[PDB]
Amino acid sequence: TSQELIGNCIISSIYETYFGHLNERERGDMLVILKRLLGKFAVKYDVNYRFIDYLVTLDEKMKWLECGLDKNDYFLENMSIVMNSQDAVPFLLDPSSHMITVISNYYGNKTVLLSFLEEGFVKRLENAVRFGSVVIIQDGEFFDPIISRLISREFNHAGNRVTVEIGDHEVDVSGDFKLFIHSCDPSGDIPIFLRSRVRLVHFVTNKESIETRIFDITLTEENAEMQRKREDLIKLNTEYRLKLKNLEKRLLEELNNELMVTLNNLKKEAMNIEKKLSESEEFFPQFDNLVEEYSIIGKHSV
Amino acid sequence: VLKWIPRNLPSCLINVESSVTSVKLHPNLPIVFVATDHGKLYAFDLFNYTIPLASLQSHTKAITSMDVLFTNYTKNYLVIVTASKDLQIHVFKWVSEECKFQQIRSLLGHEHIVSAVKIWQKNNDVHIASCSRDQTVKIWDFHNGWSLKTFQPHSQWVRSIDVLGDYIISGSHDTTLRLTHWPSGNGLSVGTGHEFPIEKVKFIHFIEDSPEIRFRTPSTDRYKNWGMQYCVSASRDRTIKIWEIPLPTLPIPNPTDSNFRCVLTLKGHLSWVRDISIRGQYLFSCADDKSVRCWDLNTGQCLHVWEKLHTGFVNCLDLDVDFDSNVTPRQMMVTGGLDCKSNVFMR
Amino acid sequence: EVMRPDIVIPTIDTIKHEKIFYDLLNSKRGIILCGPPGSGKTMIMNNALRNSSLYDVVGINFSKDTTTEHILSALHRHTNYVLTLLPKSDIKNLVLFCDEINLPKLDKYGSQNVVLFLRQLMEKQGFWKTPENKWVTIERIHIVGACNPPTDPGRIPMSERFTRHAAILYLGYPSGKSLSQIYEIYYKAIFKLVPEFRSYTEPFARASVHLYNECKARYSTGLQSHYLFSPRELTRLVRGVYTAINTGPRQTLRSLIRLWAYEAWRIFADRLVGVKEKNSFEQLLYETVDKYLPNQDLGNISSTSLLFSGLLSLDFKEVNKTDLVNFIEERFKTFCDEELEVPMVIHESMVDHILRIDRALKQVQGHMMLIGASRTGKTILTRFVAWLNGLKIVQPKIHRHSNLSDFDMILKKAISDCSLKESRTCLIIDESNILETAFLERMNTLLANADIPDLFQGEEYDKLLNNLRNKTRSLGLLLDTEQELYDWFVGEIAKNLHVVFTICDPTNNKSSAMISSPALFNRCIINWMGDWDTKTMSQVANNMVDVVPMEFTDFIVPEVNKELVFTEPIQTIRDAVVNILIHFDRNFYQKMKVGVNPRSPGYFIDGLRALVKLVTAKYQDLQENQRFVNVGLEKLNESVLKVNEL
């Protein structure tokens, strides 16, 4: 596991930065050429790498899905890219204008929605950045250069406080303030000044996404049993891993300061992990067989 | 006895973990006090410089300035005032017997970082000055620990101040020198002539007896009564200039006589000059060209140049006080460089 | 005397043109001078009218927005009404020099007022006054004009009904012998400062002329639209050599050859967009120096090996690379402490760009026009350089809810602070700050002349002149006439105002008109940063990943091709990581069909920062797990040893 950390970190960072604005076919092509470049320069990566599995946990996935995110893996990857862009301000491109609801459900009542075609936009933006509320700015195709020092993060540290210059006055910031920019027209002219300095992502639906959604739907209604079985095994494996970690912590506490019961519980848990992994090892290639079975439907649909 | 000149090589070298920002000398014992860029205050012996006598960390950010004083009460001790970018001013005390720092009080009230501090005693009353980035020069009292008066003389932040009695001059980042009478709180005159922000400003002090001095002698009884004739400034335009202080109506400023006029300009520094200090008839200065220059007051030309004295910049310079008869002018000079070298010049 | 723009070396072509120009004026005939942009129409024109005992000068420059009111107002300061119009002089006739007559644009009906007005006063000998319906007979006032050919965009083709009354003169480029003679005179004037090298004036001029000819022949307009060369490049080379010699130390032969090579690099090869073109220019400089100045003891003539800077000392001399890099690092740390803070990485390309920007910003009327990819360090680099030289930085806050009034107010404030307060101003202009064509017209007026005359009019003009007179009396200068106040004011503006143009997408039509504008092209200094090359990417990545622990596992060095590794040859895992990141950036930009567009390295920097943070977090988690399992295994071993013992 340790010999394949640098390659996985390279892949995950490149996936976070470069692949925000690409469809699934181009994402797969760039990922396979990145794996080829890693294999050429003698850097070891994870042979069974998956971005969602490696970067984010199941709790974040459940929180996103409860908030209103779609079940698509492309949308999950885009949401994970958005929530892991702590430095660059994320730029969301929604034809359906749906992710405002998801972000609002994630942040609760702290979210404030603005627009680039208002009149009191700048004053309430200064009030929001002074307080520290999460700001979502709609109509991103008409970006106004008043927030050029918020996009580029050109702050000055006024001793124990951080300040940004908006307009003709200096306004303070907060440590919990987060800026989001929303767009609705994919054909809109994003300025290069903003486009080079934001984490632009694409929540769009393309023909490759049509193929993936056709496969997802025919798997959901054609054979739901395999899907719920895989979900149950994944959830059970995660819960069993958490239980094994808790039992390991209890055994370490017992050894540092009964012991037979804890050892028996740990042995039973380890045997259960071995049995669960052995059961799940022979079930995963059936999903690949179904993928090879449901390719003609995707080709005909596209 | 005042014509001492350091030789071309340092007498001893001092190793520090980080960049040196300010150096001061103990006016009674051969002990240096070397600040750092990590907030640490050090103390080295000039005969045993392998290990520090003390090492106290009392500032989160880098120390910006330092000025020491030996107390004169009509018990006597040392008061070390260190200022730093952590929004605080700390006043120390040097325990001579135990070789330890014991903080007396800490002085707060500034909205930004501080640049320079000065401490002086008029008549059985110790006062501590300070200047900050909040464009306000505020001074405190050593015993009470509370502020006395503040004033904003400049549009941008001040960088260096100096004190004598009830007069405070303050160079600033808007390349204008201003001399303010502290009890009145009004600036007497404004300076103009430097093209870059000022670095260090201090008053030129007179001397008791000498064959001839052109810069520390009051040319008239009016100058003798006023007690101030000239002042010296250093700035980032690689220049050192001498300013004549205009005397206003007698304090109320004079509209026709409220402007500094440069008298003698010294040039030759290859980069920014950082700190200056006057000793006898010599104007010692240190710059950013890895050099320390030994100017002369009378002829106005450099007598000795110490090229390549440090690997990096030469941050701070300090010599002994000569104008006061209470503090003897011993023949040691210590320089402070950016390359962790506090070179000491003796004999 | 090499900074005065009216200094003309009298060659045989100039004398011939002056003679035929005098003959054409004396025949009572208009004159149109048309030729390439560096041919010297204005210079020969002003030299011919300046030493004339029979003709005066009415210097006017036409623009896209030009009316007959400007021409009538320019006549009213030199002509008197007696109906007949007569010049103020009794013996000397009047000549109107109308530079760039192609710039006035036709209306929606395909005609322009100005050219018809010129035709009316040039054929019917007069004009009709508007407010009281009077005919103004003109009996001795002449009229000439100069223009670029209408083939290039921006020059409107003009009607034959006007040009049929004016004789057309084509001013071609001077030949090789003429240019060699002229710049021989120029280099003699320069080398009068250095008396020990008076015998080298001719080979330097021949080398410069050959360099200009080869650069014009190789880097044609077909490659890039801004590859336009002219004798103005040679004049700027002579002026740069003078500016460096005047404030420099004692110069030897090698120092002078390297200084001329540095100036040629910064003037002829600032605008080169390709690595192969820069290598071609380096080979051209090698061949030119070998052919014309056969001197040994000459080092590399690459851009990075020629670093002339006056920041480190009191003189303009050749500084070492390491000392300059250390000084730039310390100055940038102080700048980030005292100004806005950004995490920049000091590489060789950034040092070279700092040097050339500092060289340009130290010149009188030194403006800049920076072209390159986004996030290549142009605005922050200009801000840092202007901070070194003490120039006050003014950035227009232009947003979409703005018009010409706000931009005009910003420019008025900048001009007032430049003159009335005597503060040097570095106005940084970005391409996003210019929305409509009128902003470009205002900037062209500010750059081509030394003042925008349309900004001040009426009461604003009166109060500006009152403030100007008060400022002149404040400094004790005896000026009373309006002309002395005005030309002193425009001299102060041309002395203490620097405009830096920032262009990010030159492929766009707005930036294409920004680059192709004649006022900006002929006055500003181009600096094509472009996209990062792989050496700069390797330097940035190695300086950005060396602060994180990455060597923990064994790494087997593979065998690869020589040109597939851009970093220094691989010995650790950091070099492999840097090479992988550079290779994927190149592959990603190649397979997205970006074309010949500049590549913004923002993706690369963001990837480096994300990789550093992720490696830090993952290595911390892995080390925590390793420590946990090691503590647990040690405790289990102790327990089993205690069990086996008892």
Ligand SMILES: Nc1ncnc2c1ncn2[C@@H]1O[C@H](COP(=O)(O)OP(=O)(O)O)[C@@H](O)[C@H]1O
């Ligand atoms: N015969 C010449 N003597 C001196 N300099 C010349 C001569 N011919 C051309 N030049 C140079 O060419 C440039 C032409 O400038 P200019 O007259 O403004 O060109 P244009 O008016 O066509 O834009 C001048 O800067 C000058 O230095």
Ligand SMILES: Nc1ncnc2c1ncn2[C@@H]1O[C@H](COP(=O)(O)OP(=O)(O)O)[C@@H](O)[C@H]1O
């Ligand atoms: N060594 C470097 N050279 C150029 N840009 C850098 C370097 N290091 C970091 N940067 C990035 O460049 C950005 C500043 O670019 P800026 O000059 O504002 O772009 P532009 O040139 O389009 O105005 C910073 O946000 C920083 O992340």
Ligand SMILES: [Mg+2]
């Ligand atoms: Mg011309």
